[PDB]
Symmetry: C2
Subunit: 304 residues, 2 copies
């Protein structure tokens, strides 16, 4: 067996919430979440929530993880798709996901470039490792049912594991999306903090945070560059800039239907007609990054 | 602000004054892209081709990182203020090698690996100075003595003269295989010549000596096998037969051929169509197979 390190091997997993939620586009749905868990200490390092299963959540949650913690020397990514249980998450959404169109690229290809070795099973034969996911469901994504779904605040929207659950009945009962997200962030934070962890590392004494704080300090990581991060963002189809240095984006799809116009001095006087926008849905209402049709970074266009 | 070996690399293209009979028979003047370590002045890699295209950059870059690793703070310079690198930074038609290639963009590849590109010759914000040297002998231009002016290429040497059609050189043209061989030797001689009168060398050491000395200090990371394959050219999907083998109609700027590759793993998988990542140079030996969606499958050898 090869020595394992904090951040050295992370396991990806999804989770369907047993809580009805009124999403940003008025739809009442059962939110789906993708987590990135540190295999060695079990701490949850990042996640992204959306109306359904889609690569964007994997892509952007990966970005949060590497941005916050850095890239280890021997980085290992696991997305156990044995039965094909990840086939839904790995399918690209329809370009009009947010009304405005996106460029068909592939995050899987981006992870490899960054230095991540991908695995589509539960073991890492080459290292002799094999428990990507923990034994006790409590330490895996299933353990998050008690901190989020069961959370008091979500008591009215909770549905339980009823496969055939009528959204129609939950119209007036749905919890506010912004509230759910807040609850989610707190749920996760508590999972990572609970003491009395029945694991080997913790030895029924420490919390996942305790062992991660300890082990992570022994690790050597590099922090991604400015560009490495932006490339992990989504590429919007070239929008034609006007002479005044502004452009519009009809934000629809799964997001709050809006019509944002971004402006940035440089854009104007600079010799540019069309620009390629690189964004993150969660910041779309605030900032976006502009690039020429050839790829050169033009500027950081703010909203108006 | 002390610069380290491998920290700042400068790329520059060179147009040869020697007529060569390429693999596709065409007698042309070969273009080459060089990567040079700004600190020590040592040439780290190059790629030769019929014209000027982004492929040579993408592949020469892969050779450099595969050999020396990726340092912590990596800077890459391609001065295009005078319009110089204009043609190099353009791709060829997808049928440049006969079969079709996907329209990727290597510029985006360099960034995802941690490189910081600059389109000028000075690295803004650091007291390093400029990429291109003063004494032109220490640059790409000093390769004329060791390559173009090589005795072995005397018949095809056109010397400096923009106006010079293949005309006289229909049969005077030196064969590609010999050129490339002479190229590799020239570059190695450039790097080995001692008494280099630079600050670093002090009219005593050679570019090689100083690089060995300085590079020993640089902390780098070797790229993974996947990072390396992702730098290779993406071919359009082909139909893998049930026998676990497929065809690649090589041509265009390369000698025509109908190569057949094979690998058992292809039968065991339910793969009908496979994506091929190749290196023009290794097409006659190996190719890398990837699932239509992006999952590595295996290395198919050439039959």
């Amino acid at each position: 067996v090869e020595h394992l390190d904090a951040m050295q091997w992370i396991n990806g997993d999804g989770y369907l919430h047993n809580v009805f939620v009124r999403w940003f586009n008025g739809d009442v749905i059962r939110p789906k979440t993708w987590f990135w868990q540190d295999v060695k200490t079990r701490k949850i390092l990042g996640w992204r929530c959306d109306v359904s299963e889609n690569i964007d959540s994997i892509r952007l949650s990966f970005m949060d993880v590497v941005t916050r913690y850095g890239i280890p020397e021997d980085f290992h990514i696991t997305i156990d798709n044995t039965r094909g249980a990840a086939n839904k998450w790995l399918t690209g959404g329809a370009p009009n996901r947010y009304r405005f169109k996106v460029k068909e690229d592939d995050p899987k290809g981006l992870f490899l470039l960054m230095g991540a070795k991908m695995h589509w099973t539960s073991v890492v034969a080459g290292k002799g490792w094999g428990q990507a996911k923990p034994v006790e469901r409590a330490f895996g994504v299933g353990g998050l049912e008690e901190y989020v779904d069961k959370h008091p605040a979500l008591a009215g929207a909770y549905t339980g594991p009823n496969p055939q659950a009528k959204p129609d009945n939950y119209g007036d009962r749905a919890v506010d999306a912004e509230l759910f997200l807040k609850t989610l962030a707190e749920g996760v934070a508590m999972f990572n903090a609970r003491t009395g962890r029945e694991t080997e590392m913790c030895g029924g004494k420490l919390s996942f945070d305790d062992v991660f704080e300890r082990e992570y300090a022994r690790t050597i990581v590099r922090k991604p560059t400015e560009e490495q991060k932006r490339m992990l963002l989504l590429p919007a189809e070239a929008v034609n800039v006007s002479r005044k240095g502004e452009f519009t984006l009809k934000v629809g799809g799964s997001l709050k239907g809006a019509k944002n116009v971004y402006y940035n001095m440089a854009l104007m006087n600079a010799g540019v007609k069309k620009v390629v926008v690189r964004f993150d849905p969660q910041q779309l209402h605030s900032t976006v990054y502009c690039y020429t049709l050839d790829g050169r970074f033009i500027c950081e266009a703010e909203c108006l």
